Amino acid sequence: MTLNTVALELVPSNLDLGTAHALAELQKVRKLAVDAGLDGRIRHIMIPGMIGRPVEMKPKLDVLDYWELVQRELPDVRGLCTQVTSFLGERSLRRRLTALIQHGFEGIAFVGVPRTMTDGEGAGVAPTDALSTFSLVKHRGVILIPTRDDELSRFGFKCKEGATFGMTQLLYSDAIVNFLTEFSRNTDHRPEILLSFGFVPKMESEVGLIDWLIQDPDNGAVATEQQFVRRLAASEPAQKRAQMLDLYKRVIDGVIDLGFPVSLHFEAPYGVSAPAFETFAAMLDYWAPD
Ligand SMILES: NC(=O)C1=CN([C@@H]2O[C@H](COP(=O)(O)OP(=O)(O)OC[C@H]3O[C@@H](n4cnc5c(N)ncnc54)[C@H](O)[C@@H]3O)[C@@H](O)[C@H]2O)C=CC1
Numbered sequence: 001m002t003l004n005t006v007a008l009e010l011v012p013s014n015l016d017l018g019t020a021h022a023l024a025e026l027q028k029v030r031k032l033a034v035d036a037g038l039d040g041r042i043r044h045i046m047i048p049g050m051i052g053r054p055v056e057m058k059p060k061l062d063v064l065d066y067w068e069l070v071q072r073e074l075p076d077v078r079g080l081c082t083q084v085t086s087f088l089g090e091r092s093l094r095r096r097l098t099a100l101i102q103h104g105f106e107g108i109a110f111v112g113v114p115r116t117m118t119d120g121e122g123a124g125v126a127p128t129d130a131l132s133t134f135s136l137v138k139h140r141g142v143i144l145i146p147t148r149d150d151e152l153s154r155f156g157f158k159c160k161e162g163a164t165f166g167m168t169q170l171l172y173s174d175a176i177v178n179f180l181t182e183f184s185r186n187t188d189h190r191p192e193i194l195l196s197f198g199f200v201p202k203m204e205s206e207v208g209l210i211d212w213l214i215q216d217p218d219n220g221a222v223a224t225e226q227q228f229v230r231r232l233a234a235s236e237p238a239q240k241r242a243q244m245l246d247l248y249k250r251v252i253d254g255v256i257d258l259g260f261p262v263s264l265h266f267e268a269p270y271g272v273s274a275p276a277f278e279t280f281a282a283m284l285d286y287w288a289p290d
Contacts, residue, residue: 002192002261003107003139003165004289005043007080008033008280009267012047012066015059019069022061026073029272036277041284044106045070046265048082051111054207055270064103071104079104080141082167084111085130086122093125097134107139109167119154131162141165144193146179147221152186159189167194167265170214172225172232174247177254184258192261195251197283199268199276200240204233209269241279245286252287263289 010029013022033039047063047070060066063081070077081100085093100108110127112119120126125133131140142158144166145151155166168176176195183189204210210229216222228247232240256262264284268276 001138001164003044003080003263004192004261005078006041006264006266006284006288007044007046007194008038008042008272009046009048009265010066010070010272012060012063015061019061019065022066022069023073026069030073032272032274032277036274036281038277038281038284040076041281041288042077042266044078044080045074046080046082046267049084049111051084051114054209054212064099067103067105078106080107080109080139081105082109082111085125085127086112088124090125090133093130094134094136097137101137107141107165108137109141109143109165110163111143128158128161131158135162139164141167141194143167143169144176144179145169146171146175147173147216147219147225151179152183155183156187156189159187159191163191165192165194165261165263168196170196170198170210170267170269171251172214172228172247173221174250174254175221175225176251180255180258180260184260190259190261192263193255194263194265195255196265196267197244197248197280198266199270199273199279200229200232200244201268201270201273201275202233203270204229207270213269237275241282244279245282248283249286256287 013025047066049063050060067079110130112127113121140163142163144155200210211226214222214225232243235243266280
């Protein structure tokens with residue numbers, strides 16, 4: 001009833017390319033994992049669903065079919081996914097969630113609305129409502145942004161409504177430690193937490209995708225994190241990873257005794273690579289779950 005896993009985010013490939021290309025790239029990802037030692041250490045693949053971005057984003061294969069392909073080249077892995085609920089009518093959301101569960105997904109993270117909208121503002125099913133209505137989904141997740149306004153009220157409402165895990169935004173500070181200490185004090189809510197850590201490549205200083213992914217205009221806690229990302233991208237490989245490891249240790253040490261099931265979520269926003277997987281592997285060598 002807990003996952004207690006390491007999850008690697010694997011984005012579906014472009015529709016342009018066809019199923020034969022996606023499979024070949026998956027065979028390459030497996031070789032990358034084995035060259036770094038990650039094969040048995042990654043229990044789940046997390047496949048994000050679709051939704052002014054410095055990288056284009058083109059039409060992708062449906063999460064359902066990319067899972068079919070992932071299963072072929074990674075025959076032991078299990079699967080999680082992300083689904084936006086706020087823009088699908090209730091009956092259509094039911095069909096979509098049923099398919100994902102039918103196709104063997106162990107857990108689904110329900111996602112709400114972007115920065116331009118307020119809570120409840122989609123014309124479809126709000127994630128808070130979805131957690132109640134589809135209580136169908138054994139492992140119902142949710143996004144957790146430790147730095148975001150009113151998140152203690154928001155995350156708690158979702159736990160009340162039935163969220164069983166929370167998947168964090170990319171963590172480039174120790175704010176999550178502050179959040180769950182307060183959260184475990186104010187509430188009896190103890191959901192499994194998927195701490196997300198993302199490899200920052202050199203080109204981030206040129207392109208700024210991770211800057212764009214984590215932005216929050218007048219926050220300052222995020223600006224602290226934004227300064228961290230720029231520091232990482234300006235760092236040569238060894239100094240960068242030790243910087244990341246220093247954060248990882250600080251986060252793991254300050255969370256693991258707080259009473260929440262702790263899982264991991266590893267992603268590479270510019271795509272998987274040996275430098276990312278070597279960085280991931282250094283992390284698990286400090287702490288990994290089971
Ligand atoms: N879809 C995915 O796979 C992932 C989603 N996210 C972020 O989660 C957001 C949705 O938040 P939920 O809690 O699921 O929805 P929600 O409907 O429960 O929360 C929406 C509220 O948060 C604000 N908000 C939305 N995105 C924000 C962001 N990136 N930073 C700061 N405030 C933001 C909105 O203005 C609104 O007040 C997406 O916009 C995305 O940026 C992060 C990682 C993964």
